[PDB]
Amino acid sequence: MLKKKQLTVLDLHPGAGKTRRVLPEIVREAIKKRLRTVILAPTRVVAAEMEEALRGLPVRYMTTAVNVTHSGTEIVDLMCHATFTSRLLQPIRVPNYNLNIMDEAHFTDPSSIAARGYISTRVEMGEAAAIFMTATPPGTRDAFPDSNSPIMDTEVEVPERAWSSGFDWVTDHSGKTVWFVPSVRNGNEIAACLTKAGKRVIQLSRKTFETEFQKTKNQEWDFVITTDISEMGANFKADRVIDSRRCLKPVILDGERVILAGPMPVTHASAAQRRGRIGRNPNKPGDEYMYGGGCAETDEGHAHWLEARMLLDNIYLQDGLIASLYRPEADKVAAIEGEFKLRTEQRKTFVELMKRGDLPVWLAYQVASAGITYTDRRWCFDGTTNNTIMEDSVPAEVWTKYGEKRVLKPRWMDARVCSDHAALKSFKEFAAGKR
Numbered sequence: 001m002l003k004k005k006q007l008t009v010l011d012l013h014p015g016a017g018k019t020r021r022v023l024p025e026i027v028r029e030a031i032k033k034r035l036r037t038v039i040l041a042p043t044r045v046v047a048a049e050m051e052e053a054l055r056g057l058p059v060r061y062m063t064t065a066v067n068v069t070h071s072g073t074e075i076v077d078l079m080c081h082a083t084f085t086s087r088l089l090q091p092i093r094v095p096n097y098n099l100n101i102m103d104e105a106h107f108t109d110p111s112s113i114a115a116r117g118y119i120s121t122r123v124e125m126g127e128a129a130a131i132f133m134t135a136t137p138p139g140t141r142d143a144f145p146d147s148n149s150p151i152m153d154t155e156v157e158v159p160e161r162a163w164s165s166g167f168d169w170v171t172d173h174s175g176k177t178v179w180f181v182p183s184v185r186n187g188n189e190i191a192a193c194l195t196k197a198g199k200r201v202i203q204l205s206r207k208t209f210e211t212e213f214q215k216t217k218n219q220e221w222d223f224v225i226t227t228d229i230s231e232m233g234a235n236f237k238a239d240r241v242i243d244s245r246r247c248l249k250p251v252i253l254d255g256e257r258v259i260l261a262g263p264m265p266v267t268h269a270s271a272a273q274r275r276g277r278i279g280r281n282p283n284k285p286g287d288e289y290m291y292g293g294g295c296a297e298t299d300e301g302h303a304h305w306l307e308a309r310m311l312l313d314n315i316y317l318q319d320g321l322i323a324s325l326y327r328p329e330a331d332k333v334a335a336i337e338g339e340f341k342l343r344t345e346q347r348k349t350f351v352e353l354m355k356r357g358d359l360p361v362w363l364a365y366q367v368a369s370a371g372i373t374y375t376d377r378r379w380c381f382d383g384t385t386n387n388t389i390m391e392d393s394v395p396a397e398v399w400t401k402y403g404e405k406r407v408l409k410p411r412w413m414d415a416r417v418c419s420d421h422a423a424l425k426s427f428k429e430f431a432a433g434k435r
């Protein structure tokens with residue numbers, strides 16, 4: 001598995017022991033062969049779980065999620081998928097790792113797709129080996145894979161709004177349920193409905209994940225309401241999953257705006273990962289999976305694959321060569337390698353708009369490619385009337401860094417900057433010159 005020019009897909013079913021049993025054995029063999037190795041975790045929660053599975057092995061934890069210190073004699077590094085892609089983009093030398101291990105390799109955020117593309121290109125060049133660990137590799141068509149214990153699969157209408165009647169099975173249940181919703185706003189409405197009915201609810205999303213996930217271990221709860229982020233190796237002591245089978249899809253329209261289309265069907269890989277949260281204990285058969293729609297290949301034309309190409313076009317590989325996307329996911333976007341390659345000063349602005357600005361990749365690219373510098377926010381106010389951002393049915397307003405009250409009307413509109421209250425609050429701070 002560790003021999004050069006080889007990319008292995010470790011696709012044992014969910015709960016088979018890829019992280020706790022297989023990963024430590026791979027790491028011991030890599031250290032025995034003196035292979036400089038990187039281990040990529042999707043989130044800080046998974047990074048902390050990996051430290052427990054690898055306890056005692058000499059691994060350098062490049063994350064504040066773990067408090068270890070480090071002897072300085074480690075040849076194995078562990079960091080998040082986003083951290084790897086970030087360091088490749090920045091003017092910091094990333095070692096040319098002999099072995100590249102990606103856990104939860106099905107993650108479809110732009111930085112995870114870009115990491116797979118870079119790593120698989122190095123393997124294709126004959127420079128390195130790689131191991132992608134996931135039960136659901138790209139293009140998987142099976143939403144119902146094997147599990148540690150039998151699961152009761154039931155197709156049923158699932159609420160996506162508050163309800164007064166017609167869904168007694170949802171609240172009549174005495175165990176713990178993990179419920180996948182298509183958006184933070186949709187989860188807020190379901191959570192309020194369940195709280196009014198006397199249930200204890202925890203809500204999870206990308207921005208709150210680490211803090212709120214701790215509550216699932218520290219307090220008693222009846223429901224966890226979560227977006228698709230919990231598909232990335234998050235584990236729960238639950239006996240039921242309720243799956244809307246829906247997600248939002250970012251879509252670039254006419255190359256000039258990004259909308260959040262849907263909700264629409266999830267992929268088979270997402271459905272198998274949502275279901276895969278239960279049936280994990282061989283001693284507790286009969287965990288339930290209630291699902292409310294079919295699957296479709298909604299990653300085709302999804303903005304994340306075009307955003308992954310924007311990142312890869314701006315990562316040095318060798319001279320003018322540019323890394324390709326990992327072959328099984330390369331047809332998800334219609335893009336020419338190198339079309340998003342920026343000159344040095346515009347590339348530095350693109351990186352800073354993502355790293356410090358916290359803007360979506362597509363929006364950071366529009367601003368940097370237009371020749372605008374990082375601190376210049378005039379573009380947040382000079383768009384057309386149809387780009388006005390709305391807050392509680394009235395235009396959002398901010399005080400500019402000049403002390404002028406203005407309506408938020410960005411030159412390029414990316415729906416992800418106002419998808420929920422937290423995102424719009426962060427974007428208002430950015431438009432005001434506060435970061």
Ligand SMILES: C[C@H](Oc1ccc(-c2ccccc2)cc1)C(=O)O
Nearest residue numbers: 044060061062063064065070080083
């Ligand atoms: C804030 C933290 O970022 C870090 C990024 C890199 C390192 C590091 C450790 C040893 C050697 C070289 C680099 C540590 C932390 C995080 O992202 O959690």
